[PDB]
C-alpha cells in the first residue's frame, strides 16, 4: 500500500515513500504540493470579455 511521488527540488539541478497509517482522513498528511491556480474569477470577472487589442469599451 505504498505511494511514490517526486520531491520538491529546484530547476536545472527523489521519489520518496508515503504509507497511510491511521484509519481516518484527518490523520493524512498536509497536501503541500497543490500548485494549481486560475485568476479567472478575481481578474476578468466580466461578461463580454476584453481582447487587450480592441479599445475595451470604446
Amino acid at each position: 500500500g505504498a505511494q511514490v511521488s517526486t520531491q520538491k527540488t529546484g530547476a536545472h539541478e527523489i521519489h520518496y515513500t508515503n504509507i497511510n497509517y491511521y484509519k481516518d482522513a484527518a490523520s493524512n498528511s498536509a497536501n503541500r504540493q497543490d500548485f494549481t491556480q486560475d485568476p479567472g474569477k478575481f481578474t476578468e470577472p466580466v461578461k463580454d470579455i476584453m481582447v487587450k487589442s480592441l479599445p475595451a469599451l470604446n
Binding site: 529546484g10 481516518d24 497536501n31 500548485f35 470577472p45 466580466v46 479599445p55 475595451a56
Partner: protein
C-alpha cells in the same frame, strides 16, 4: 509541476493595438505582460509559486491561549483551569485566518507544558514526575467542579495523559462545523427579532477544554503553564477579503478605534533628498 509564465520577445511596433489604454471603470483588472511596453528579451523563468499556496500559508503551528493552574492552593478554581475553544484571542493566527470569509480545515493540536516550582518554606522536596489530563468536552457536557470530582472519568470524552520528560502530545481534530465551513464572519443576530447578541459569536459553538493535575495534594505548589498550538491542514478557503488595518479590541466582536490609513511622508514629491 507548474511554472510561472515566461517572457515573450517583442520589437519595434506602431499599431492601433493599445495594451496601455484600458477601462478600469468596469472593474476588469488589466493584464499587461511586460512584453508590451518596452522591448523585452526572451526569459526562461523557472519560478514556482510553491510557498504561497493556501495550504502552505496557514499550515504553521500557532499559539492561541496560555493556561495557568497550580497543583495545590487554597481555592478549588485556581487548581484546574478551563478554556473555551476559540481561535480569536491572538492577533497573529486570527489575522492570518481573516483573509477569508469561509474556510474548511482539520485541526491538529499540540500542547506544550512547563512546570515552575513556586516559592515556599519547604521547596527542597523529592518530587516525582507530574502527570496532566486534558479532557475535551463537547457542547453541553458535564461541568467539572473540582480536581477530585467524578466528572473527570472520561467514559466517552477525548482525553490525553502526558508525563513530563517526553515529546509533547499531538492529536488531530476533523472538520466539526455543523454547516459547511467555519464562519470567520457572520453578519446577523441570534434571535429572529433581530435582537440578542451580534456576532461572530452566535456560531462559535466549539466546546471547551479542561486541564488538571492527576497527582494528589503535593507538599509544594507547582505553577503549570500549558500552551496550545493549532495547526490546520487540508485547507480549502473561499471568497477572500482584505486584511485588518486597525488593532483588535475583544474576542466576541469586531469593534475598534479608527487608525490612520498609513504613516505620513511629510513630502509628496521625491528628490535626491
Amino acid at each position: 509541476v507548474v511554472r510561472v509564465a515566461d517572457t515573450m520577445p517583442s520589437g519595434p511596433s506602431n499599431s492601433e493595438s493599445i495594451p496601455a489604454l484600458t477601462a478600469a471603470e468596469t472593474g476588469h483588472t488589466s493584464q499587461v505582460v511586460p512584453s508590451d511596453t518596452i522591448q523585452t528579451r526572451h526569459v526562461r523563468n523557472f519560478h514556482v509559486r510553491s510557498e504561497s499556496s493556501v495550504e502552505n500559508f496557514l499550515s504553521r503551528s500557532a499559539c492561541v491561549y496560555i493556561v495557568e493552574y497550580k497543583t495545590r492552593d487554597d481555592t478549588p478554581d485556581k487548581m484546574y483551569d478551563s478554556w473555551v475553544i476559540n481561535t480569536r484571542q491572538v492577533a497573529q493566527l486570527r489575522r492570518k485566518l481573516e483573509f477569508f470569509t469561509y474556510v474548511r480545515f482539520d485541526v491538529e493540536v499540540t500542547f506544550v507544558i512547563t512546570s515552575v516550582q513556586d516559592d515556599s518554606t519547604r521547596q527542597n522536596t523529592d518530587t516525582p514526575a507530574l502527570t496532566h489530563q486534558i479532557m475535551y468536552v463537547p457542547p453541553g457536557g458535564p461541568i467539572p467542579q473540582a480536581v477530585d470530582d467524578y466528572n473527570w472519568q472520561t467514559s466517552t470524552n477525548p482525553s490525553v495523559f502526558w508525563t513530563e520528560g517526553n515529546a509533547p502530545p499531538r492529536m488531530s481534530i476533523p472538520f466539526m462545523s455543523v454547516g459547511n465551513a467555519y464562519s470567520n464572519f457572520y453578519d446577523g443576530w441570534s434571535h429572529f427579532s433581530q435582537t440578542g447578541v451580534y456576532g461572530f459569536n452566535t456560531l462559535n459553538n466549539m466546546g471547551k477544554l479542561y486541564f488538571r493535575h492527576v497527582n494528589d495534594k503535593t507538599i509544594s505548589p507547582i505553577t503549570s503553564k500549558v500552551r496550545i498550538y493549532f495547526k490546520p491542514k487540508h485547507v480549502k478557503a473561499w471568497v477572500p477579503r482584505p486584511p485588518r488595518l486597525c488593532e483588535y479590541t475583544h474576542k466576541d466582536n469586531v469593534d475598534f478605534e479608527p487608525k490612520g490609513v498609513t504613516t505620513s511622508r511629510t513630502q509628496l514629491t521625491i528628490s535626491n533628498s
